[PDB]
């Protein structure tokens, strides 16, 4: 099964196990303080449509 995890996060429970809460961090393949286009990629990997 595939579970989408966002900034607000999820909490998944399976069987009688106690619930497990997970949150998604601000990860991406872009470079933060490099060339301009790497910065484009950085701010596109997180918040795509807004930076487009």
């Amino acid at each position: 099964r595939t579970i989408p995890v966002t900034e607000d996060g999820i909490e998944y429970r399976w069987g009688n196990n106690p619930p497990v809460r997970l949150w998604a961090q601000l990860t991406t393949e872009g470079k933060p303080h490099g060339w301009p286009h790497e910065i484009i990629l950085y701010y596109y990997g997180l918040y795509p449509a807004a930076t487009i």
């Binding site: 995890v5 900034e7 997970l22 949150w23 998604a24 961090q25 601000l26 933060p32 918040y47």
Partner: protein, 438 residues
């Protein structure tokens, strides 16, 4: 001292409220939400459970005749049948072949364990919020519980604290609520006295101690077969068991904002939505004088490493010069980053380390140590884990600094374009001036 602050409605997050008192040394306070509870008001409508069809032994009038008698019984049926010739094991029960009647009587009654096994239909309105807050400032460290409204004040170490009303009126419960044991369902239960057989609410009772019971189960009576005493009847199955094996998941599995629904009493706890206004009444005793507080000057901020992760991935090194050791209050005047510690040890070496959490690539938060001022600038990095099991400790600010590399390139391009545009404007202005000159 009169001071108001606004805190997020998030459990496990400590807000840092800073008091700049005039004649005293600044103080930074720990506002920690340990747990909330959104408590709706329930109006019981009726009680629904499995029914019990009571079929007494039929009276068989051997060579005779009786008439049906009306009874004040819920879902009562009474059918007389003529011409019956029943049989027993030893032989024929009655005497005449066709001159006989059998009295069939059946009715619906509250089951013996509606007192145990039942579901309650409620109406939820005017949810009342109550939250648990820890106050730890200066030398004290206390926890108290208060109703979240502008009409409750609780004493904390001589202080008058009032948490003003929940920013939003949002509730996870709908108008109609059905509760079974520890589960709560957002269900449109049928109105009282209008139940259908085979569905939830087929039989309804106002109270567990109710004497009046409404039953609509479409009970039917039919001729017995020849030579048999069995009181045939066909009736709709219980809607309670149908609901039990068609209920599905409760509100706990679909509540927004990560609400945890419990019963006894029905409540929604630790919902992460809205803000909690805070009004503070701090006496003089808590504060410290600047004559006994160290004087901090020459504060510069330089940053070694910073990562904008959920936790405090930013590391800040501060340099300053003090006269005496002691304890300063540290605060971030900008939401870009939040300093993990509120008071650090201030000594002679003049250098201190701080842990801060940010969410932007180039954060610009401002740090004040005692009464000193400085600007902290950093280049934070994209972190390592796609997923972490803890929530973000920052305010989720992703706008880079006005002086960040991206904003530096944008500003350079804008400056060049504006210089070209202003040069064109000046050239055209001079040309037009010369034209009107001639």
């Amino acid at each position: 001292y009169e001071h108001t602050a606004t805190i997020p409605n998030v459990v496990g997050f400590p807000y840092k409220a800073h008091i700049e008192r005039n004649g005293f040394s600044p103080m930074t306070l720990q506002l920690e939400v340990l747990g909330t509870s959104l408590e709706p008001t329930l109006n019981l409508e009726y009680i629904t459970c499995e029914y019990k069809t009571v079929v007494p032994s039929p009276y068989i009038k051997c060579c005779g005749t009786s008439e049906c008698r009306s009874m004040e019984r819920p879902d009562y049926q009474c059918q007389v049948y003529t011409g019956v010739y029943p049989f027993m094991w030893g032989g024929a029960y009655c005497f005449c072949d066709t001159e006989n009647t059998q009295l069939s009587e059946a009715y619906v009654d509250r089951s013996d364990v509606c007192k145990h096994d039942h579901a309650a239909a409620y109406k939820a309105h005017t949810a009342a919020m109550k939250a648990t807050i820890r106050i730890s400032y200066g030398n004290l460290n206390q926890t108290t519980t208060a109703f979240v409204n502008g009409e409750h004040t609780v004493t904390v170490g001589g202080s008058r604290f009032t948490f003003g009303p929940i920013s939003t009126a949002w509730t996870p419960f709908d108008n109609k609520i059905v509760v079974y044991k520890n589960d709560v369902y957002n269900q449109d239960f049928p109105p009282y006295g209008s139940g259908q057989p085979g569905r939830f609410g087929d039989i309804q009772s106002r109270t567990v101690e109710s004497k009046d019971l409404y039953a609509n189960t479409a009970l039917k009576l039919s001729r017995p077969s020849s030579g048999t005493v069995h009181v045939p009847y066909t009736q709709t199955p219980s809607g309670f068991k149908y609901w039990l094996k068609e209920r599905g998941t409760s509100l706990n599995d679909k509540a927004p904002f990560g609400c945890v629904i419990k019963t006894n009493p029905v409540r929604a706890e630790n919902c992460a939505v809205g803000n909690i206004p805070v009004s503070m009444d701090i006496p003089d005793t808590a504060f410290t004088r600047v004559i006994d507080a160290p004087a901090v000057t020459n504060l510069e901020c330089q940053v070694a490493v910073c990562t904008h992760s959920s936790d405090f991935g930013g590391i800040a090194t501060l340099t300053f010069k003090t006269d005496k050791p002691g304890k300063c209050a540290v605060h971030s005047h900008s939401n870009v980053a939040t300093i993990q510690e509120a008071a650090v040890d201030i000594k002679t070496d003049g250098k201190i380390t701080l842990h801060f959490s940010t969410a932007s690539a180039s954060p610009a938060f401002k740090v004040s140590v005692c009464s000193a001022k400085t600007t902290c600038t950093a280049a934070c990095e994209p972190p390592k884990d796609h997923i972490v099991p803890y929530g973000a400790s920052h305010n989720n600010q992703v706008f880079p600094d006005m002086s960040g590399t991206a904003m530096t390139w944008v500003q350079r391009v804008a400056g060049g374009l504006g210089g070209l545009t202003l040069a064109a404007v000046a050239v055209l202005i001079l040309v037009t001036c010369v034209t009107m000159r001639r």
